[PDB]
Enzyme design. Structure first.
Site, PDB file in Angstrom:
ATOM      1  CG  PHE A 144      57.617   7.814  28.759  1.00 14.75           C
ATOM      2  CD1 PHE A 144      56.776   6.841  29.571  1.00 14.75           C
ATOM      3  CD2 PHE A 144      57.092   8.964  28.146  1.00 14.75           C
ATOM      4  CE1 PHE A 144      55.465   7.398  29.983  1.00 14.75           C
ATOM      5  CE2 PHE A 144      55.562   9.148  28.399  1.00 14.75           C
ATOM      6  CZ  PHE A 144      54.932   8.338  29.363  1.00 14.75           C
ATOM      7  CB  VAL A 145      60.438   3.805  32.769  1.00 19.19           C
ATOM      8  CG1 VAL A 145      62.022   3.266  31.837  1.00 19.19           C
ATOM      9  CG2 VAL A 145      61.041   4.981  33.492  1.00 19.19           C
ATOM     10  CD  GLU A 169      61.129  12.400  46.132  1.00 19.10           C
ATOM     11  OE1 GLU A 169      60.623  13.618  46.473  1.00 19.10           O
ATOM     12  OE2 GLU A 169      61.686  12.318  44.910  1.00 19.10           O
ATOM     13  CG  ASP A 170      57.665   5.701  43.760  1.00 20.44           C
ATOM     14  OD1 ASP A 170      58.062   4.622  44.505  1.00 20.44           O
ATOM     15  OD2 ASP A 170      56.744   6.275  43.750  1.00 20.44           O
ATOM     16  CE  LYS A 211      62.630   8.433  33.625  1.00 20.45           C
ATOM     17  NZ  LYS A 211      61.610   9.036  33.048  1.00 20.45           N
ATOM     18  NE  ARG A 248      47.375   3.000  39.789  1.00 22.36           N
ATOM     19  CZ  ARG A 248      48.245   3.949  40.517  1.00 22.36           C
ATOM     20  NH1 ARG A 248      49.246   3.493  41.222  1.00 22.36           N
ATOM     21  NH2 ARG A 248      48.025   5.161  40.633  1.00 22.36           N
ATOM     22  CG  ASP A 308      61.295  15.641  43.444  1.00 21.42           C
ATOM     23  OD1 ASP A 308      62.341  16.230  43.604  1.00 21.42           O
ATOM     24  OD2 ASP A 308      60.382  15.278  44.019  1.00 21.42           O
TER      25      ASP A 308
END
Lengths: 199, 199, 199, 199
Positions: free
Chosen positions: D168-169, D115-116, D147, D181, D119
């Site tokens: 907020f990145v 995952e980036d 995070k 992008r 979650d």
């Protein structure tokens, strides 16, 4: 191995098949050796060099003729290779100019002479003679390009990237009056470019 | 512009957070400037150089001190920008040695009317730089600027990559007795490293 | 535009001229398309796509068949071009699967008024493509184009990387039973390779 | 290891220290993680993954959330690593969407969920439960970013690139309404950019 041979019957890739700086659109005929192909071949040359010269400390003697790309790429691949060595491998990188060469204590070491395009045999013979006066462990020559000139039989490098016909090529590490340095591919120059950028 | 400033309090990155050649595992304290960060910073330096010196013939005078990496990467990024130019702009690359006494591929007379960029990995002595600049300016260059990857606190270059504390760093373009050439990150050597690779 | 055409007579590059993983030494016949050439060709495809579809919101529909490399490289080059744009232009990336039956991150309704680019590594069946295009066009996209890295002779994509003969190739983005993913070049598998890695 | 920790007291690099697309000049606050640093860290994650999961055939389960860069970079480094293996290493690359997952026969294999940005814990717990129903040899999770949200205690990934504050990145693999992008660095968005590119 004489390297990747590109026959005289090969004109090269049409320019619209590759990405070329817009400002060189009319200054070139064809792309002879795509940048990526140069890299792939150079990666293999790095392997061949280490296999045959990894025996002793290597001194890379790069002959400055205007460009730096080939020296940087070859050395970058070589280093990436020695990166996985179980033992720390020392290496020396020197840049010389040519004839007269410009404290060479390369005694007891494996000397790798590096060139973008191999010069005449007499010039190469002379350089080899000068280097051997320092009693190196061995002396090998690597050249990205070897041109089949109609003149006398040229020198036979130990490591050759590509063997090409006698065409006026520019790009990658072959500038023309300081133009084409931003061109990453080796390409054949056009009469238009030849005139436009003539000294 | 001091560039990216690394405070004296900055410990650096732990070695286990990055990919380091195994044969250097005990030879380093930690990573000071990751290779990727060096690249990103150098790409911005390229833009800054082109912003102030672009549009005209740039002559890049690279001062050889054993490394080629910084010269190569800076020049690669500069050339990548030069490619999008509507007009073809020539550029000269010359690797020279100091001691006054400059060894270049051509007389300094060619510097007249051109934008001269002196490039170095690190500037130890400021006096040597003051002298070189004086020599260069004697040929009436259009302008003369200096770019250095690193600046150790305790001459102020026009383009600075990173300003670090006065520590013994190796890697990227700072070999130690021909060792660490295969180390891509700039790191602080360890006591074990210094003794092990000492000349 | 057929893209780079590789004749049926083209034997390919001998394996000894390039860097190939040792564990594949007996599993391949030769190198058909060197990784570097694939990259160079893909960079031009990026420019062609942007020339015809740039300036507007592009939605890249990548058809998953096991590989991601081509999608990634094409998109990387496209994004590199999008960066120099004076105005920020949005772009959507969506990896979908076929069977009609499309698995995307959002309804096709979002395709309305956008420039749709379907991307594939290779197009085996032309009918499946004709169907997908029909489905997409039902949502009134501004335009719909197709890009494929390879096209085997015996549907004509709008953007083609290479047109090769009908041979069993592996590498880059064409794994064989999950093998050859680490092979960067596109090559022809050998009889030894087929049997060794057969499912 | 919790990866590279970036404290709440870290604002990030001034934008003028790095190369940023001109069109995003007022849309960002600071560069939080330079692209090159992401690569360097990801290279190390690849090594950590292979060391702990090289035991059996690995299936990379990439959770699609809009981006592809992290998946491509991680997998590229992993492959470059398995390239030097004395034995051919098979590997499977799958992309899924999330909750409900979108023939998972990963039985008897080492599953790497990628995952980036990790979650919530309940979401991660649910995914782990679903995957374990297939009786995999092992299940590990790798996330580029983690995070420190003020809410409940998040999941603890097995491999973490960077642990960051609740900012907020955008960039690299984190688009905002399909913008950014083309931004290679992870950066903090500005109120200007937030409004300008709001859906």
């Amino acid at each position: 191995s004489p390297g990747v041979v590109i026959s005289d019957d090969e004109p090269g890739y049409d320019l619209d098949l590759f990405c070329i700086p817009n400002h060189y659109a009319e200054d070139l005929e064809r792309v002879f050796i795509p940048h990526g192909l140069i890299m792939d071949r150079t990666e293999r040359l790095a392997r061949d060099v280490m296999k045959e010269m990894g025996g002793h400390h290597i001194v890379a003697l790069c002959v400055l003729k205007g460009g730096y790309k080939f020296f940087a790429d070859l050395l970058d691949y070589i280093k990436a290779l020695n990166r996985n060595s179980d033992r720390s491998i020392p290496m020396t990188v020197d840049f010389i100019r040519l004839i007269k060469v410009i404290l060479s204590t390369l005694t007891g070491k494996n000397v790798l002479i590096v060139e973008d395009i191999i010069d005449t045999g007499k010039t190469m013979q002379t350089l080899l003679s000068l280097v051997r006066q320092y009693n190196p462990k061995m002396v090998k020559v690597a050249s990205l390009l070897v041109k089949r000139t109609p003149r006398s039989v040229g020198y036979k490098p130990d490591f050759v990237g590509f063997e090409i016909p006698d065409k006026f090529v520019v790009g990658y590490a072959l500038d023309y009056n300081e133009y084409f340095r931003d061109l990453n591919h080796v390409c054949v120059i056009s009469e238009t470019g030849k005139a436009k950028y003539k000294a």
